[PDB]
Amino acid sequence: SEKYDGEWNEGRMQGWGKYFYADGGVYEGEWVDGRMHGRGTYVFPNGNKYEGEWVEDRKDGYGILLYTNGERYEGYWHLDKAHGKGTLTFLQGDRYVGEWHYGKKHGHGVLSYSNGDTYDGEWRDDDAWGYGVLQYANGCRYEGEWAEDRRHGKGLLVLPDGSSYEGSFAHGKKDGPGKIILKDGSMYIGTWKDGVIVGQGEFRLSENCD
Amino acid sequence: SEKYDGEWNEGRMQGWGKYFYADGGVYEGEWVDGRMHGRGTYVFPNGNKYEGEWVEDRKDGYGILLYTNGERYEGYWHLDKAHGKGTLTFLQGDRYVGEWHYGKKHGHGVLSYSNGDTYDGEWRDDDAWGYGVLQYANGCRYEGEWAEDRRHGKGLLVLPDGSSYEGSFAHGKKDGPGKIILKDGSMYIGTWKDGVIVGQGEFRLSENCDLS
């Protein structure tokens, strides 16, 4: 009573009710055995707002959280964190659609950046990890391996003009053995370090004129 | 005396006269001191014909020789051989216009092949020798050194698509140190043997949307 305006059952909050927390936060929604449980709205004193499902005072099931910072999560929650399928939109216009593991981008997901870049592929612990495709705004496309949100392992870099690089990347740059095919179809097989050709390599003219 | 129907001076053939040689050849033309000398026509028993200038029984000055085999020389002669400027046309349609040294293509000369190919440059002893340009029919152009009628020394090979090779040739083929530009600007510096790249070399990307 006073701090809780709602229904009771066996001396515990149960049914619909409003609760005013000491820090200025307000819940209005379903209660089970004295906890937020079922559908309910939580307006936080920091400006955040949740509308969705609750289990034992935690966000659990379907819910929408509008963040102060302009971010908006719409999808599934487990133990008070993003879990399963969910969409995160940012104020700038960036959008993530895909899999979540206790509050982190994890599994397969598509992140459409407002800058025009799109990443379609694998995530671990909020970073690009595994195989994924980045379609850059300028026409460049990387299809290959990622580690700690950077291109790392074997990958294909197709340029707008038709040029490609097939080979190794390390810490985001061409690094190790690789091959470039040029506009005219001729190919160079050689070695990169920190994104630049080092030493010498094999050059083979295309069979389309010589 | 009956072999010659023409004029005399100091008991020697001089002025205009006809002569019938034992082998069936016939000269009609100018005579000086009992020799073919000045303007005259010689029909040879092998079918060849000369019309032009003579000095002491030799083709010397301007003259046309039509050969049985279909070749035609038109130009200058010295001591009975092509010498100075002269045009040789062949049955096939091939044409040489340029310099001659005692019967050989020698100095500067243009050979227009019926193929469409043109060679403009230097000759020694009937072969391309020194600097010359071959404008091929297909658009390719070689500008560089020749030896024994084949590309040999340093040369530039520009392809129709803008690709070029700058470097060494031996016996007609890319051979030794050289460099390719691909027109997109990208360049390979390496080594050739018998017209093919051998081993490895230096590759430098051009400023296309590939180093950016």
Residue numbers in the entry:
A (entry chain CCC): 143 to 352
B (entry chain AAA): 143 to 354
Give the original sentences from the paper that presented this experimental model.
High-resolution crystal structures and biophysical analyses of a truncated form of the TbMORN1 protein and its homologues from the parasites Toxoplasma gondii (TgMORN1) and Plasmodium falciparum (PfMORN1) enabled, for the first time, a structure-based definition of the MORN repeat. All three structures are antiparallel dimers joined via their C-termini, and, when possessed of the correct key residues, can adopt extended or V-shaped quaternary structures. The crystal structures confirmed that each 23-amino acid MORN repeat is composed of a β-hairpin followed by a 6-residue loop that connects to the next MORN repeat. The structural studies presented here make a case that one conserved function of MORN repeats is in homotypic interactions and possibly also in higher-order assembly.
The structures of TgMORN1(7–15) and both P21 and C2 crystal forms of TbMORN1(7–15) were subsequently determined to 2.90, 2.35 and 2.53 Å resolution, respectively, with the PfMORN1(7–15) structure used as a search model for the molecular replacement. The two subunits in the TbMORN1(7–15) C2 crystal form and the TgMORN1(7–15) dimer make a rather straight assembly, while in the P21 form they display a bend of about 30°, leading to a rod-shaped particle appearance. In contrast to the other two proteins, the P21 crystal structure of TbMORN1(7–15) displays a bend of approximately 30° among the sub-units. Superimposing the TbMORN1(7–15) P21 subunit with the structures of the TgMORN1(7–15) and PfMORN1(7–15) subunits over 202 Cα atoms yielded rmsd values of 1.0 and 1.1 Å, respectively, revealing high structural similarity between the three proteins. In the P21 and C2 TbMORN1(7–15) crystal forms, the dimer interfaces occupy surface areas of 747 Å2 and 966 Å2, respectively. Calculations of gain in solvation free energy (ΔiG) upon dimer formation for TbMORN1(7–15) C2 and P21 performed with the PDBePISA package yielded values of -20.1 kcal/mol and -11.3 kcal/mol, respectively, with corresponding p-values of interface specificity 0.01 and 0.08. ΔiG values lower than -10 to -15 kcal/mol and p-values lower than 0.5 are significant for stable protein dimers, indicating highly specific dimerisation interfaces. In the P21 crystal structure, the position of the loop differs from that in the C2 dimer and keeps the Cα atoms of Cys351 and Cys282 at a distance of 11.7 Å, preventing disulphide bond formation. Here, the side chain of Cys351 is engaged in a polar interaction with Asp303. (A) Conservation map of the TbMORN1(7–15) P21 crystal structure reveals a highly conserved stretch of residues along the groove. Analysis of the interaction and electrostatic maps of TbMORN1(7–15) and its mutagenised variants clearly showed that Arg293 and Lys316, residing in repeats 13 and 14 respectively, are crucial for maintaining TbMORN1 in a stable dimeric state through electrostatic interactions.
